[PDB]
């Protein structure tokens, strides 16, 4: 029944209505966030049978997250409000472009995900299993969870799509590669941004040799992206649009690709689709508000 | 020379613009809170020389706490940004009155507060040293600070004011009673709200027997308040207005009482002043936004 | 198994942010309404298994109706988007109380509702079938549906609940009385608001004689309400709060009564529950935004 | 033919969206005010043919005054934009009720108003000529206009209505009393608010003796109002609603009284009408935003 | 006295504050719309004596429309609130550019306009008579109205300016041309957009031969426009500006041209002016909010 | 202790939330303004010991200004609320770019600054003394103040940095040069915009010969700027950013330069820094909201 299964800790996003330092702000918008959540919702809007695995707290915010996933029609068979608090963060985008994020996630009910965080018979028949580097950077349990996950998916013959999503706050470049070197063996698909490649490896190049998965997609910001399949290297043109809030764009990019593959799409149409979802998210507010719905696809370049 | 010195954990309050369940709110108002901070501003606006002692993380909200403090005129000699984050809390006020609160302050830069947090010589010549039962509830480190704090003011001939401000989310009634029995000997003035007394000492009367400090004041909500000084029991009438946002209405109360005290007025005037301040805030949004200014008093009533 | 099944025309409500004449309003708040939809959500939030049967056009607002329904947990097995548009209505609440309403629903996708709209077997084992006098007023097609609907639930041993909810803009008192005399035999529980009774049956007492259904409840605004069960007449005290937006306060009422019923409680508790729900909504904006959740009840009062 | 002609200084009012000290407000609501303008709109909305005589600078706000006037239907035959600026004023309404006002109108284009400001023949056949004690307080130039104005209406058999509307910021009680003793002989109807009477004539009763005009009405706030016509003293009950923004509640009052008068109704109806208008505005924001329309009356009450 | 006379059904516009699907919105801005209304108001702001012919409903929205036309100083001698409802629509502009509109106009009081919808002696002396394709697409009566109109105008020697404004929702391409083929004989001036030309004819070219009026202006989006007079073909440069809401731009374009002609302007200055008004409307929110006022003209390129 | 000392009259700014004529607006944002204030705050955010000299009124707005200067940590040793009103102005930015400002400053408490407006021993040790052409254009006293100021600064060996900031409303081009010709002798640094140079002199060229100060900086809008030191002429590249509200940009530019010099920066790094602060202010709302803080500098090109 289910084609994709993404997992990790969801978050509630607090953002200023316009650029400027957070200190001068007095009104914050609230959105639902979380790399996997963003992926889970983007896939669902596309008409893809997706399911999300994770925990929120027994508070008002966890209830917000659940309604978003539920209204979006994402499988929550293994998602539920567990005792504890729902993590949140505050963002701030400066006039010229400098941006910083403040987390209030340490200890959340969502950062508990330990191995066996669900029934492996869930993954049966499933095409993909998308996870993001943020999760394992959350808790020893989380790190344990990641690995276990893909293993149990591959065991079911389910392809493992992963997105680096390196976050400086959550851990150092070392521990990052350490994780990578370890989990790369089962990763059928790896999503990576250019900055990340040069921040954890120095030069995109070395990054690309160490991290060799069957299929690898490099998000190059507005310069589109590069998909690596069959030694052959494809390039994708980015959709030119005014970048409202670049947050969530990468996940939409990843979500767009996965829908491409799931629908058995040629590496080009999978890239075109990815850049499209990423331009929508970038062109809007919130973490995944701009995710398109299938019925919108046809009319988009 | 400073007349009052307040100290505790600064906080940032998030508030829906109107009643309802937080889960449905899309916007949040940002306010500078903290029990002792509220007391400190109030006094600052009243012309009383007040100093606040505390720590905000080295982030944007901490800067916002710092900028509000400076804006008011609260001496920050011993207040400063230190590594870590500034704690924040959300607030829900339901259609039928009763609402809930959610903290994001555990492990914050402010809940560090331990003994020798500031140079005691600070308290020299200071009329009062204000604390709140919230402070010692934040951590053993802070619990000790509280004790050291008043022992150091007592040693300086400074009056020690304490407001139970008991918060169940923080510690149990027992954990609270315990701190009270040990603190009380150092307390000259005690503020209490009927609820807290009944929720901690069965019935108001009992609480009063146990906490027999030189001067004790009982906030009875809009139903007035009794001041117990020298075997005498003055009862003070409450001001009438519609309960907007009552959060911190007690801190406004305490500050007005203290100001009158510091101003050497009768018990009947401290209670009026204290009642006026409290109502003005409860009629206002935020945590101490409605606190009146010196100029205003002369006419109000 | 479903305990309640509601059905009628979903609606989108537009509301000025505060009182005044609509002609001067520059902004409108968007809410999900519909009498039976309001009842359905309320129950959904209370833990009662409820199903809504209806149609929204194949447009953006219809999707919004659908997404709210899903968010709450209302079974849409027999609810779905069908060609046409979703009806909407504006709302004016004047400075001195009395306000006016304006519909844009004639010819909508929802006002189609005709016999055999859903598969009757749906009602199997269902405690109640809720309808509203609004439904049969929308069209001969819908008027028949109503009749067929309850005849099909009656045939299934399902209790048939009906709320007059008479709207003059829709049909005349006569056109309404007529539908009532013919419907009534199939009705087990009847909800009525003094006004509607006097505006349709001269005086409350008369209306009561004519509409003598097994169980009848009279909403007397904030002045309480009488429940007429088994020759007995229980009178239930109303909750006190300030009339924010009373629209749909009756649907909240009906839903709380039904829940208590479905929960097998005394008449005295159904009226309390019913009164609590109603007040919570009237104290809130939108159509059922203030409806309380299971968790909340345990403490409210 | 015009039934009423009003005249004075138009104004733009700036208002915080809710109570509190202006110093902290970051947004201001923009409204079209002016005592005589308020009276003029009210009448315009009531179906009474009214003309306003005044000047707005040749700027954007003046255009806004002009556009509101036109929108309502107030004859601007003798109203027009002239070099200079349009005056504006801010408004502060504190948590505990009492608030303050701040003018920015000195030297404005409207405070020019001098004798022969308009062609007197205008007043021909006009039931009333309305003025306000605000006008002559603006400048010797305007003070004279006032006098000339009513002497010219009296000369035309037009009734001269005057509303003390005393503003301390403008002139002293003396400077005001003085204008009153000299104006009064030309006044047929006088509106006064208890406060102004006590703040200018010690006690209400005294003021009444001094200002013995043919018809005199005493606005006693929400506590009603007495109408003194032909040795008789009719007392009119006030409408009940919560004091939103009371600014200009008196102008709404005066306009409703005048309308009833112009409509040849009993004193008991003018007071009801006058009380209704006033309450509707006080229940609304702005200066005359809540003023009801003809259509509305028929039902209100 | 009157130079131009435009006619058709006015509408109230409901629009999101930012891009994104209407389903995720919760606040809508309200503006007055209607191709002719937009034209009528734009002309008036330019200092052109214009008059609007049409009907709104006896509701709050029709009252909004009238105040806009009245405040803007547009002749309403033959415009009035007739019994019934005022039409409205909802718009939605997507992140990348895809847009869709939802109508709630079928049956409005404004869609009744049948022949003799006013006194032909109105058109005497009038230079132009602007109508738009939307009107005849409204009701058989409307279609009858259009034709009759121009006829009665030409009969008075008044030039007939028309703007295609093809709308897919309101009717098919066939019926569109059918109308065109019929009414073209009296159309002295035709306004057409490039998309329209290729959607009702296929290629701009054929469109331009079939539809041959004395003077024809082709709106080519941002690529400016082409005016066809005397076999000679002129081209106009579009004003480069960020396109806020492209709705209403075409009417402003048409309005700008007409003011050019009315003022006896060279085909170039008539085009320059048209592109200017169209850039203003495009550069702002609402349907015609951005229409400039004459006093602004000089300072604009 | 103090490095820079700027002086002049502060103002409160009222601005529309989006472009469009002020007449159509209904909500205004409030910000603190004043060329020197903007300079004073920008310097302080940079970590420069600055002090502001000037007067505000004894009203709510003067209290707003003081909190901004105080929170920003600007020396107010010689700044204080003197009896009287605080000046304000209204701005309005049109769709295409045309902008106009409306002043309500004539007579403000801040426009009194006469010679000896502070204790000259204030300037001791001070590096700079920045003033702006607006001040002397305010009141004869103000003009007297300007001159006296620099004199007393030079007397202390403090460099005199001045910014033309010609304002058409406040005075004519003649009186402007008249002032310039007079005060240029003590001006060590002159800031001038290109338009100003061609509006008071005709051609930038002549402007540059008459006005020859040791160091002169020409703000050329987005084309960066030109710094003239040692006969040598340097050029600065402007930061490309979308211009939100260009108001305050010049002062930020001036503030950025001064921080450059104060920090002993090479004419290039002083220009780079200036263009940076000017791009921030231009890229944000308000008069100086976008001023960066030192900790932000490193990460900015
Ligand atoms: N301004 C933009 N315009 C178009 N596409 C964008 C823009 N910003 C991001 N994207 C899309 O999102 C994908 C990722 O961009 P990127 O920002 O690097 O991911 P991340 O969320 O990690 O920052 C890109 O490959 C691109 O297709
Ligand atoms: N609705 C109200 N009206 C007037 N005064 C109030 C109101 N709510 C609180 N206060 C004032 O605040 C003081 C404390 O009330 P209380 O609510 O008990 O403090 P706390 O914030 O701890 O709950 C009271 O004694 C009273 O003077
Ligand atoms: N202002 C109010 N305060 C408390 N309860 C209210 C209020 N308005 C409505 N209710 C509740 O809603 C129920 C119905 O009131 P009513 O207004 O008559 O329903 P309806 O929405 O049909 O008008 C009442 O019996 C009462 O419990
Ligand atoms: N809160 C209120 N409720 C009802 N009517 C009010 C209220 N405030 C003012 N009014 C009406 O306005 C009229 C005048 O009240 P008042 O406040 O004295 O005028 P003013 O604007 O000059 O102060 C009153 O006689 C009354 O009818
Ligand atoms: N983004 C834009 N920039 C400048 N002018 C525009 C823009 N969008 C529309 N216009 C102006 O409006 C006129 C019509 O544009 P168009 O959008 O094609 O009409 P329509 O309202 O039918 O869509 C054009 O000829 C042009 O002058
Ligand atoms: N749109 C913009 N982009 C970048 N820098 C700008 C922009 N507008 C202004 N600036 C900066 O502000 C400085 C002054 O610009 P300018 O507008 O001419 O000063 P002013 O405030 O007097 O108008 C310039 O030299 C430039 O560095
Ligand atoms: O950055 C994080 O911590 C998140 O997971 C929240 C964001 O929505 C996510 O990163 C988007 O990429
Ligand atoms: O709860 C706390 O810790 C706070 O200090 C926040 C509020 O400002 C406080 O409760 C008001 O007394
Ligand atoms: O009036 C209707 O048809 C509705 O159902 C809309 C409201 O939600 C309903 O009146 C509330 O009972
Ligand atoms: O105070 C004034 O001068 C005004 O006219 C403004 C207000 O509209 C007036 O006070 C209301 O009566
Ligand atoms: O599109 C319609 O139905 C309208 O007439 C409303 C719009 O304002 C008009 O089309 C603008 O071109
Ligand atoms: O223009 C004026 O009058 C001001 O001083 C206020 C502005 O903030 C200043 O000019 C910015 O350059």
Q: Which domains are assigned to chain D?
A: 1-301 (3.40.1190.20)
Looking up tokens 């203003």 gives E280
3-state helix, strand, coil in chain A (%, to 5): 40, 20, 40
* C34 CA distance to ligand 9 middle (Å): 5
* E243 torsion bin: left (phi>0), alpha (psi -120 to 50), beta (else): beta
Mutate to test the interface with F, among E240, E249, E292 (most CBs of F within 10 A): E292
For B278, which residue in chain D has the nearest alpha carbon? D96
Which chain D residues are Cβ-neighbours of B239 within 8 angstroms?
96
Pocket test for ligand 11, best of E52, E196, E287 (most atoms within 8 A of CB): E287
Half-sphere exposure of A157 (CA within 13 A, CB side): 2
Q: Whose CA is nearest to atom 2 of ligand 10?
A: D34
Q: E57: nearest CA in chain C?
A: C102
What single string gives the DSSP state of each residue in F147-169? HHHHHHHHTTT-B-EEE----TT
DSSP B148-181: HHHHHHHTTT-EEEEE----TTTS-HHHHHHHHH
Q: Is F174 exposed, middle or buried (0-12, 13-18, 19+ CB in 10 A)?
A: exposed
Asked if B68 lies within 8 A of F73 by C-beta distance, the reply is: no
Considering CB atoms only, which of B289, B293, B300 is closest to D96? B300
Q: Is the Cβ pair A70, C68 closer than 8 Å?
A: no
CB of C250 shorter than 6 A to ligand 9: yes
Q: Is the backbone of residue A283 left (phi > 0), alpha (psi -120 to 50) or beta?
A: alpha
Catalytic positions of E, written as ranges:
251
Residue A40, helix vs strand vs coil: helix
User: CB within 8 A of D136, min separation 6: which ones?
Assistant: D142, D143, D145, D146, D147, D179, D183
CB A126 within 8 A of CB A5: yes
| Torsional sign, CA B191, B194, B196, B201 | positive
Q: Which ligand is nearest to the CA of F239?
A: 6
The residues of C carrying an active-site annotation are 251
Closest ligand to C-alpha of residue D245 is 4
Contact C283 B98 (CB under 8 A): no
Q: Are C289 and C68 in contact (CB under 8 A)?
A: no
HSE value, Cβ hemisphere, 13 Å, CA-based, for B118: 26
Cβ neighbours for D57, distance < 8 A, ≥ 6 positions apart? D81, D82, D83, D84, D85, D86, D108, D109, D110
Phi-psi group of C264: left, alpha or beta (phi > 0 → left; psi -120 to 50 → alpha; rest → beta):
left
Structure tokens at D86: 């349009």
Q: How many CB atoms lie within 10 A of CB A237?
A: 13
Distances in Å between the Cα of B119 and the Cα atoms of B147, B148, B183 are 15, 12, 21
User: Using the beta-carbon criterion (under 8 Å), do E60 and C29 form an inter-chain contact?
Assistant: no
Count of positions (residues) in chain D: 301
Please list, in sequence order, all residues whose beta carbon lies within 8 angstroms of the beta carbon of residue B185, skipping any fewer than 6 positions away. none
Residues from chain A contacting residue C67 (CB–CB below 8 Å): 71-72
Q: Chains meeting A at 3+ CB pairs closer than 8 A?
A: B, C, E, F
User: What is the rounded CA–CA span in Å between residue B262 and residue F282?
Assistant: 48
| Chain C residues near residue A71 by CB distance under 8 angstroms | 67-68, 70-71
The residue assigned the tokens 């070197």 is: A181
**Which pair of structure tokens corresponds to residue F251?**
């002062």
Backbone angles phi, psi at D195, to 5 degrees: -45, -60
CA distance D288 to chain F (A): 15
B276 touches B301 (CB < 8 A): yes
**D5 closest CA partner among D42, D41, D40, D56:** D40
Ligand 9 site-directed mutation target among C10, C146, C165, most atoms within 8 Å of CB: C165
What method did the depositors use to determine the structure? X-ray
**E230 inside 8 A of chain A by CB:** no
Nearest alpha carbon to residue E200 among E226, E169, E166: E166
Other beta carbons within 10 Å of C83:
10
Q: Are D249 and D238 in contact (CB under 8 A)?
A: no
Any atom of ligand 5 within 6 Å of the Cβ of E278: yes
Contact yes or no for E25/A286 (Cβ under 8 A)? no
- Cα B274 to averaged position of ligand 2 atoms, centre (Å): 10
Q: How far is C9 from chain E (nearest CA, A)?
A: 17
Write down how long chain B is.
301
Q: b/e for C136-149, b at 16 or more Cβ within 10 A?
A: bbbbeebbbbbbeb
d(C-alpha A55, C-alpha A64), whole Å = 13
- Give the closest residue (by CA) to ligand 12 atom 6: F34
Instruction: Give Cβ neighbours of residue C32 (< 8 Å, ≥ 6 apart).
Output: C10, C11, C12, C13, C41, C64, C65, C68, C69, C286, C287, C288
The answer to whether E95 contacts A239, with C-beta atoms less than 8 Å apart, is no
The answer to whether F91 and F14 have CB atoms below 8 angstroms apart is: yes
Q: Is F254 exposed, middle or buried (0-12, 13-18, 19+ CB in 10 A)?
A: buried
Q: Are E239 and E249 contacting, i.e. CB atoms less than 8 angstroms apart?
A: no
Question: Ligand 12 centre from D257 Cα, in Å?
Answer: 47
- Which residues 6+ apart lie within 8 Å of E208 measured at CB? E197, E216, E218, E228
Q: Are A289 and E24 in contact (CB under 8 A)?
A: yes
> How many Cα atoms occupy the beta-carbon half-sphere of A91 within 13 Å?
25
Closest residue to atom 11 of ligand 7, CA basis = A248
Chains that touch E (3 or more CB pairs under 8 A): A, C, D, F
Q: Does C81 touch chain A (CB under 8 A)?
A: no
**Which residue has the least CA distance to atom 17 on ligand 3?**
C221
DSSP E194-242: HHHHHHHSSSHHHHHHHS--SEEEEE-GGG-EEEEETTEEEEEPPP---
Of A21, A24, A98, the CB nearest to F299: A98
- Residue to mutate among E21, E95, E99, with most A CBs inside 10 A, is E95
Residue F128 Cα to chain centre, angstroms: 13
Rounded CA separation B179/A265 (Å): 67
């Amino acid at each position: 029944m289910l084609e994709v299964v993404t997992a990790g800790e969801p978050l509630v996003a607090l953002v200023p209505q316009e650029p400027g330092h957070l200190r001068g702000k007095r009104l914050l918008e609230v959105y639902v966030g979380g790399a996997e959540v963003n992926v889970a919702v983007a896939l669902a809007r596309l008409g893809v049978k997706v399911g999300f695995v994770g925990r929120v707290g027994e508070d008002e915010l966890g209830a917000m997250v659940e309604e978003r996933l539920r209204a979006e029609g994402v499988d929550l068979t293994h998602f539920r409000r567990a005792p504890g608090f729902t993590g949140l963060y505050l963002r701030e985008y400066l006039p010229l472009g400098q941006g910083r994020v403040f987390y209030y996630r340490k200890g959340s009910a969502g950062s508990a995900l330990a191995p066996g965080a669900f029934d492996p018979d869930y993954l049966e028949g499933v095409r993909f299993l998308h996870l993001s580097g943020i999760t394992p950077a959350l808790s020893p349990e989380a790190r344990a969870f990641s690995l276990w996950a893909m293993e149990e998916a591959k065991r079911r013959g389910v392809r493992v799509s992963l997105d680096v999503n390196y976050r400086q706050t959550l851990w150092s470049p070392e521990e990052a590669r350490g994780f990578l070197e370890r989990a790369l063996p089962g990763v059928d698909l790896l999503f990576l941004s250019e900055e990340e490649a040069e921040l954890l490896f120095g030069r995109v190049e070395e990054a690309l040799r160490a991290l060799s998965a069957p299929e690898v997609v490099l998000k190059r910001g507005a310069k589109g992206a590069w998909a690596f399949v069959d030694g052959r290297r494809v390039e994708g043109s980015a959709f030119a649009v005014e970048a409202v809030d670049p947050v969530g764009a990468g996940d939409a990019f990843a979500a767009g690709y996965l829908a491409g593959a799931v629908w058995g799409l040629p590496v080009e149409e999978r890239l075109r689709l990815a850049n499209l979802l990423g331009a929508s998210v970038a062109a809007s507010r919130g973490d995944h508000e701009g995710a398109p719905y299938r019925e919108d696809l046809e009319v988009l370049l």
